């Protein structure tokens, strides 16, 4: 109901989801409070990882209600401290995307296939497969 007026797609390092004065000048004009801002998104994120921005929705209600289903950080997004390289997209032809293996890339595309579903899991698999090579370098296995 209220998704249209408040609008910021941004997630800082989610050790504490959405710290108040840490993000930037889009959430300042957003009445959403801080009491439940990092309670269930700093602990219940363990289904994917802790330290990565928990992909979540920005849906609140005009009646002050808040319901959303948080998605996960990408396997490519996780490829900054978990898949080795702090460098990445933009220069995958002039740099490496990391010592990335497909023995792990396929397993990550299959086990993180919960949020982006589809008719066949191979569809979300190809989705993540383009998402990693969206940098330009992906595990060649």
């Amino acid at each position: 109901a209220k998704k249209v007026q408040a609008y910021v797609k941004l997630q800082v390092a989610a050790g504490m989801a959405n710290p108040s004065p840490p993000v930037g000048p889009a959430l300042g004009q957003q009445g959403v409070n801080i009491m439940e801002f990092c309670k269930a998104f700093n602990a219940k994120t363990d289904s994917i990882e802790k330290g990565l921005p928990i992909p979540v929705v920005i849906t609140v209600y005009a009646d002050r209600s808040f319901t959303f289903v948080t998605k996960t950080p990408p396997a490519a997004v996780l490829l900054k401290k978990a898949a080795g390289i702090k460098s990445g997209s933009g220069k995958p032809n002039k740099d490496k995307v990391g010592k990335i293996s497909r023995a792990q890339l396929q397993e990550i595309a299959q086990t993180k296939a919960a949020d982006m579903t589809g008719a066949d899991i191979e569809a979300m698999t190809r989705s993540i497969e383009g998402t990693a090579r969206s940098m330009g370098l992906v595990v060649e296995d």
């Binding site: 108040s20 004065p21 840490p22 993000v23 930037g24 000048p25 889009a26 959430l27 300042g28 004009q29």
Partner: protein, 70 residues
């Protein structure tokens, strides 16, 4: 702040205001607030405190060499 030769460094938005940091040169700030109030409808104030030094091509300092105390 960018009109002035100043560089912005983060702009967290706390509620009921926005906090905007920028290490602006001191020369580009000698009437700031009156102009800032024009920009903010008199609803903002600025606090400045010297940090460091850098350069911008200005022979205006060569202009002021022999006018006073050559």
């Amino acid at each position: 702040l960018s009109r002035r030769r100043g560089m912005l460094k983060g702009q967290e938005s706390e509620v009921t205001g926005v906090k905007i940091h920028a290490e602006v040169p001191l020369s580009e700030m000698f009437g700031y607030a009156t102009q800032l109030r024009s920009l903010t409808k008199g609803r903002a104030s600025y606090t400045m405190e010297f940090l460091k030094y850098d350069e911008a091509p200005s022979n205006v300092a060569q202009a002021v060499i022999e006018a006073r105390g050559k």
